[PDB]
Design a protein around this ligand. Structure first.
Ligand SMILES: CC(=O)N[C@H]1[C@H]([C@H](O)[C@H](O)CO)O[C@@](O)(C(=O)O)C[C@@H]1O
Ligand SMILES: CC(=O)N[C@H]1[C@H]([C@H](O)[C@H](O)CO)O[C@@](O)(C(=O)O)C[C@@H]1O
Ligand SMILES: CC(=O)N[C@H]1[C@H]([C@H](O)[C@H](O)CO)O[C@@](O)(C(=O)O)C[C@@H]1O
Ligand SMILES: CC(=O)N[C@H]1[C@H]([C@H](O)[C@H](O)CO)O[C@@](O)(C(=O)O)C[C@@H]1O
Ligand SMILES: CC(=O)N[C@H]1[C@H]([C@H](O)[C@H](O)CO)O[C@@](O)(C(=O)O)C[C@@H]1O
Ligand SMILES: CC(=O)N[C@H]1[C@H]([C@H](O)[C@H](O)CO)O[C@@](O)(C(=O)O)C[C@@H]1O
Ligand SMILES: CC(=O)N[C@H]1[C@H]([C@H](O)[C@H](O)CO)O[C@@](O)(C(=O)O)C[C@@H]1O
Ligand SMILES: CC(=O)N[C@H]1[C@H]([C@H](O)[C@H](O)CO)O[C@@](O)(C(=O)O)C[C@@H]1O
Ligand SMILES: CC(=O)N[C@@H]1[C@@H](O)[C@H](O)[C@@H](CO)O[C@H]1O
Ligand SMILES: CC(=O)N[C@@H]1[C@@H](O)[C@H](O)[C@@H](CO)O[C@H]1O
Ligand SMILES: CC(=O)N[C@@H]1[C@@H](O)[C@H](O)[C@@H](CO)O[C@H]1O
Ligand SMILES: CC(=O)N[C@@H]1[C@@H](O)[C@H](O)[C@@H](CO)O[C@H]1O
Ligand SMILES: *[C@@H]1O[C@H](CO)[C@@H](O)[C@H](O)[C@H]1NC(C)=O
Ligand SMILES: OC[C@H]1O[C@@H](O)[C@@H](O)[C@@H](O)[C@@H]1O
Ligand SMILES: OC[C@H]1O[C@@H](O)[C@@H](O)[C@@H](O)[C@@H]1O
Ligand SMILES: OC[C@H]1O[C@@H](O)[C@@H](O)[C@@H](O)[C@@H]1O
Ligand SMILES: OC[C@H]1O[C@H](O)[C@@H](O)[C@@H](O)[C@@H]1O
Ligand SMILES: OC[C@H]1O[C@H](O)[C@@H](O)[C@@H](O)[C@@H]1O
Ligand SMILES: OC[C@H]1O[C@H](O)[C@@H](O)[C@@H](O)[C@@H]1O
Ligand SMILES: OC[C@H]1O[C@H](O)[C@@H](O)[C@@H](O)[C@@H]1O
Ligand SMILES: OC[C@H]1O[C@H](O)[C@@H](O)[C@@H](O)[C@@H]1O
Ligand SMILES: OC[C@H]1O[C@H](O)[C@@H](O)[C@@H](O)[C@@H]1O
Ligand SMILES: OC[C@H]1O[C@H](O)[C@@H](O)[C@@H](O)[C@@H]1O
Ligand SMILES: OC[C@H]1O[C@H](O)[C@@H](O)[C@@H](O)[C@@H]1O
Ligand SMILES: OC[C@H]1O[C@H](O)[C@@H](O)[C@@H](O)[C@@H]1O
Ligand SMILES: OC[C@H]1O[C@H](O)[C@@H](O)[C@@H](O)[C@@H]1O
Ligand SMILES: [Ca+2]
Ligand SMILES: [Ca+2]
Ligand SMILES: [Ca+2]
Ligand SMILES: [Ca+2]
Lengths: 389, 389, 389, 389
């Protein structure tokens, strides 16, 4: 056991293979499955786990009614063995709250959750399963964070947090942790105009966080973090291939340093990309308006070229099925000379798009890169809504 | 592993951060969750766990009917991973009976349960998960104990027990254990006139037990124990801020050495406080009459000053929601230079306050000290009783 | 770490303290609890576990219907953490069949199950979780064994087995195992005329098995086994206090060497006793006709004196409640200078005594000796049969 | 821990003893049990586990409806502790997909699953719980594999795969893995004309794979693999005792080098055999037409003599009960001088044979060889289909 160092480059990726799928809604139709949303996966030296914000009720329970609501005193971050569906019997409570992140540094796991009222939230930072630090809201408006895993290097794990408006300038900070203790706090710098729900990974000693601009941009903000110097820079993804949801049609040219407006009717969704020159892949919903479908697009130089377009594609979820948030993770402890990109897609079921039921929940699908040319099919949730009526 | 020694001082506390909530009643409305009461938490070198007295049925089961009853041959102390809800599938039986205490001495856990008929109860003392000692009733009237964790120092774990009337003078003893064997027994001494359900913690080589006087006082008795000499003193919390339930209004002056009587209609409830000069916090139900709401009041010198009032407060459970028992615990194995205060609140649902159902049970919330000034909100149970009708 | 040696003497016993109780039937009214019968307990260096023969269905399942039947291809020996109820989620399948025994030699656990048709059953002997040895029926009539734990000394664990009529002379053997391999087989010798379902325990290098004579005696046969020499003798309990069920009134004198007959209407039930001169205790159903109630009786010199009677008694289950099989076990790995006797009572619910349901199952209660004079109460099953109607 | 090698000989087998049975359909009538099919068992240094392809839904759930269907994005290979029934709470996801194999090389477990659309399937190869290698379909027609365990020798684990028509010549390959990495690929060679679903086992440094010819033969193809040279040969079982399902009556002579045609109405079923000169056993369904009943036949020189007939038999499942797939496995880590043959029988319930329900699933029974002459009885599933109507 030692601290993880981000000493390896990203593996070449040409295709995406299936890693895990929990079929939670299908199973939760009759088994005791907790309602969730905002899932992800995170790994450690022993393997990978799935994570999500429980709503403190089962899917078939009468308390599933009303779970469209994002914040309550009944939510908590829970983790479970990858592949299983989350039940009250197989899940570990990482922390209490309604927004979270988590990562392993090679020694222990840090987990963070925000809870409390809108104008007075606080974060609690846990390490090795114990509470270490507490951070009060600094802008009095829903202190909140990534909703996917953080990334560590030589013991130092940066985390992106925001507090302030969802539709206006907000106060974002990069907080650098070691064993759950604050090493440094920076205010967000650079040209990104709004930051939410960053999806982050590391490679070659560099951490990149592709985030959600909920205020103006249909293009995604990118923050580049040096976890050794504990400094960062920010801007937008340059590609004309817009990846936020509710975006206009892709334009002739993207914009590296300003948001591209437009889209209807959603201001944003969590998402991700892996940016590695020619070896760059962008995820997005297939629908430009809604959280339906999901596609991976290989867009060489998407980080630096406003003219970059797709040279290959892979449908992860067809546009006849619902998707949701998407984010990045990597099994940094794999026995490979490169760090292989993985991602998950949250498959939201229920409200508001399916209003024949009273609840909102999701299942999870996750895939990682392949150098091979693999065939594919749609990994939709798979549940029949009529069965819940 | 080594014996825990109470060598550290209490951490400074200015507010309370969320530690855990199990949402047991919400989840138990449709998953297989045990009916409980008298819950608490207790930690060890590896972490913290939740404890409670099962009723030997699930919340939705037909045998949940009648569970307002406190004592039966179908109760047992159970423990389980912090944050999970107590099911028949994830709970460890610590011992059999209907009143208990438990604590880890740094090497192993000691667990104690009382069972039997009112006029002939006995305690069984467990250590390392094996029964070590048995203790028969000495006053033939519901031999009973703490209903929250005991505390250990150099292997010596004092426990406060009582046998005798609930509504008149009784026979309290402090029994000193090491590896589940009786080292010494003392009869209660000092100015506390009635002792029940003590909530105890350790700091700076001194163990403090804040208890319930079910006979006269609305102020809580306080026993101070020297675990090395195995001797003690007792009196009452000096503060005018009364913390028992069914208490009258706070008077102008409290009384260190005599009970402050009054209040209606109930003689008492298990509660707690941390007492450390200016760094003192008293918990109580917000209602002076019923087990509803729960608030933490910072009252400097509450332990010694009859005129001490609150300088701050934090609502833990709003007064439109049910509370219950409350008690102290500490993660004595945390990687801190001080012992940080934690507490839990039992959130009782069902009878007698909610008679639309035939059962009585509870969920749990737990919080710990923070040196920061954190925002707060209500951590009420969150179940809808109508769903159970 | 090492093979257990039976070198310690039995602890002095003056009353019985509660060890465990699973409340399976109460819990199983709603939770997913397996139908069982023929339970017992058995310990190893880490702790104690509960055992029983599942019927391959849950209590509330439609397949619980018809579970009065003793033998099917759907039964198996399962073990689980002491105190929990047996569910499909927390039980380990030891082996497959419809008669069993099990014991730990200090290194690993041996478990044995018989299965197959009446005229052609077979035993499979398991060790450390792997199948070691198979034993075919020698008399073509329901090869069967103890239905409670065996006992090992220096790695040698003798097991008593019977093959032959239940209501006439049969063929009993003592098979000595080591690591699941047969070391020696002996034909039953001595004065016991019929042997079934032996309840065995060890002390001072000697193993005593108290059994059920289903053919003639209402007094119980006693087999004494020397595990080093691998030899034995047999006779009956001498006491006039008869302990099998469906017995006549206790006569003026018992008989050391021949069966005391009589009783109505059933030939036998599994039972046990601890025999240590003055320190001797006999368990039996309170009713002399049916398996109801259960009492422990201290009968000095029960093993040698035909006029020995009780000098103390403890009611374990009141005569208004159903009991069932009873058997011996000891936690040989306790941190004590003596081996402390323990026993369990099988609490049978359903058919044939409770015919308003279609199933037969049980719950378990277990107790151990105390040197103290402890109060007591009835530890009956606690389920309300009407809730299953 | 070392790499396992196959130098030991097969144990002599004269009868079959019961190893395990999970009773999953009986139990799943009321507990939360996953719908499965294509089960098997596989062992490692610690013991054995049960495997199967889940359908991503419980047996009682509404999504059970439609589970006759073999391939969907909702299936996954799951493993669990031998003897338990597969629930959402005790199952490990080995990989995602609708065809699999798995085996332990003495150091870690390799698991492989195929998923994707019929024309573009892909395999993901896992080792030690991590994804290692991906393989795209090469014939573009349902790439598929063994549905029972693979076998490893000195780090090398051969796997047989097929891609192509089910009803005509297809493209079978042997792929040799080491730590999940491809060491070599071979096209099928020899006189076997069609290969599906091989049941494989090792002894004397040689792996034999007994398969299913779904195109022509009612006799079973046999593939002999040398795991050191990484080469193979193929032909058919010589015996007149035909072991596929939907076969004609046994002819007077079998055929070592060509398929024997006939039987109605089904083209084949996964099965197995142990081939060891005189010590040879063939399994098959009792019915020549349908997947009903199951018998083991000892047929000396079945691998080499076309006139070889049975010299003994054992009924495993009577012909009044449904059977299904059957396959081979061995506990190669047993403490024995020889490798003892084991096998399982999949017990299919529901569609198409039991059309009164909407689902298809199964339970499992497994047996291993014995040198003794043990009696036997039928180990059928035991659920009442009426209870599911
Ligand atoms: C802390 C919190 O409530 N986060 C919520 C965020 C915010 O609403 C937006 O990022 C605006 O800040 O996104 C969601 O609401 C959403 O769009 O589904 C889900 C998530 O629970
Ligand atoms: C899951 C689904 O049905 N998605 C469909 C959506 C939704 O019906 C609307 O977004 C509802 O507002 O509409 C589309 O035009 C889109 O947005 O891509 C087509 C897509 O197939
Ligand atoms: C052993 C026992 O019965 N303890 C019970 C005590 C006593 O009744 C009082 O302390 C009076 O002695 O408090 C309760 O009843 C109560 O107030 O809810 C709960 C608890 O179960
Ligand atoms: C949980 C709850 O509703 N509490 C309410 C109680 C209860 O109605 C009574 O205690 C029932 O006896 O009444 C109050 O006046 C009080 O006690 O402060 C107001 C409080 O909001
Ligand atoms: C193997 C077997 O069937 N054992 C059964 C035995 C025998 O019937 C008797 O000992 C007569 O041999 O006792 C029972 O039937 C019984 O009385 O409740 C239960 C047990 O299952
Ligand atoms: C559990 C129970 O009800 N036991 C009762 C039994 C049974 O009813 C009969 O044995 C059934 O045949 O009858 C008694 O006379 C007896 O045996 O002592 C009284 C006892 O209270
Ligand atoms: C990958 C796949 O679908 N395998 C299926 C195979 C193929 O149909 C045949 O081997 C023909 O190739 O056999 C089954 O269908 C069957 O007979 O019950 C079950 C199994 O799921
Ligand atoms: C389980 C069962 O009932 N099997 C019966 C089968 C099936 O009914 C048919 O195969 C359905 O196609 O028919 C038989 O003639 C046979 O196959 O030997 C008799 C056998 O008892
Ligand atoms: C089916 C159901 O339970 N519906 C409830 C409804 O009764 C209630 O009015 C609403 C507001 O809380 O929440 C939902
Ligand atoms: C709904 C229900 O079960 N009610 C029962 C009732 O029949 C019984 O009179 C009471 C006392 O035992 O317990 C409760
Ligand atoms: C309620 C129920 O299922 N009853 C069945 C009954 O129909 C059947 O006659 C009997 C014989 O097996 O088993 C039981
Ligand atoms: C009882 C039930 O749910 N039946 C459904 C049926 O309505 C549907 O037509 C069929 C095809 O999808 O699947 C099944
Ligand atoms: C096979 O394993 C055995 C037992 O570990 C070992 O003695 C032998 O050297 C190995 N044989 C080969 C050929 O590797
Ligand atoms: O409630 C304790 C204290 O809280 C703060 C202020 O509201 C004070 O006026 C008050 O005394
Ligand atoms: O039960 C044993 C003894 O218990 C006591 C008294 O009730 C005696 O009469 C009795 O002999
Ligand atoms: O069943 C195969 C063999 O079984 C035995 C004898 O009945 C033989 O005659 C028979 O060939
Ligand atoms: O050229 C059409 C195609 O270009 C690329 C992307 O911008 C797509 O959104 C678009 O459909
Ligand atoms: O792969 C087919 C596809 O390749 C790219 C472009 O050349 C398209 O015109 C063409 O349809
Ligand atoms: O490179 C794939 C595809 O790209 C585009 C066109 O240039 C095609 O001619 C070519 O086949
Ligand atoms: O990226 C997915 C995309 O690929 C191209 C076309 O086949 C589209 O229909 C599809 O949406
Ligand atoms: O004398 C009555 C009493 O004596 C003694 C025992 O034999 C009991 O069974 C009996 O009830
Ligand atoms: O037998 C003597 C005595 O033993 C004890 C109890 O069973 C009493 O009922 C009985 O009188
Ligand atoms: O041992 C039980 C025994 O105790 C004595 C008396 O109360 C009897 O009625 C009872 O049977
Ligand atoms: O007696 C004919 C007999 O021959 C042998 C086997 O092939 C059996 O299946 C068959 O019944
Ligand atoms: O085929 C010879 C013989 O083999 C064995 C059994 O299958 C018998 O039914 C059969 O007669
Ligand atoms: O191999 C089983 C076989 O044995 C012989 C006969 O009893 C047949 O009826 C039976 O099918
Ligand atoms: Ca946006
Ligand atoms: Ca009081
Ligand atoms: Ca008898
Ligand atoms: Ca065929």
């Amino acid at each position: 056991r030692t601290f993880l160092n981000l000493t390896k480059p990203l593996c070449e990726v040409n295709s995406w293979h299936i890693l895990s799928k929990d079929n939670a809604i299908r199973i939760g139709e009759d088994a005791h499955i907790l309602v969730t949303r905002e899932p992800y996966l995170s790994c450690d030296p022993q393997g990978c786990r799935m994570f999500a914000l429980s709503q403190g009720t089962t899917l078939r329970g009468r308390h599933a009614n009303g779970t469209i609501h994002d914040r309550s005193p009944f939510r908590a971050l829970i983790s479970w063995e990858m592949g299983q569906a989350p039940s009250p019997y197989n899940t570990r409570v990482e922390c209490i709250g309604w927004s979270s992140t988590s990562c392993h540094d090679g020694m222990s796991r840090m987990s963070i959750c925000m809870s409390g009222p809108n104008n007075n939230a606080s974060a609690v930072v846990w390490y090795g399963g114990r509470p270490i630090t507490e951070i009060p809201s600094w802008a009095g408006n829903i202190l909140r964070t990534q909703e996917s895993e953080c990334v560590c290097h030589k013991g130092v794990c940066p985390v992106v947090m925001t507090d302030g408006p969802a539709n206006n300038r907000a106060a974002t900070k990069i907080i650098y942790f070691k064993e759950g203790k604050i090493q440094k706090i920076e205010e967000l710098a650079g040209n990104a105009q709004h930051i939410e729900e960053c999806s982050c990974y590391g490679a070659g000693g560099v951490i990149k966080c592709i985030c959600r601009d909920n205020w103006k941009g249909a293009n995604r903000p990118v923050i580049t973090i040096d976890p050794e110097m504990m400094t960062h820079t920010s801007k937008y993804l340059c590609s004309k291939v817009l990846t936020d949801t509710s975006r206009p049609n892709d334009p002739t040219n993207g914009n590296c340093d300003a948001p591209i407006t437009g889209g209807s009717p959603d201001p944003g969704v969590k998402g991700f990309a892996f940016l590695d020159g020619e070896n760059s892949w962008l995820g997005r919903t297939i629908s430009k308006d809604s959280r339906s479908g999901y596609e991976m697009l290989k867009v060489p130089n998407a980080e630096t070229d406003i003219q970059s377009g797709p040279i290959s594609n892979q449908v992860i979820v067809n546009n006849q099925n619902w998707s949701g948030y998407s984010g990045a993770f990597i099994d940094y402890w794999a026995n490979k000379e490169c760090f292989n990109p993985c991602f998950y897609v949250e498959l939201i079921r229920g409200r508001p798009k399916e209003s024949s039921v009273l609840w909102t929940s999701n299942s999870i699908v996750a895939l990682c890169g392949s150098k091979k040319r693999l065939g594919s099919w749609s990994w939709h949730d798979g549940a029949e809504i009529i069965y819940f009526e």
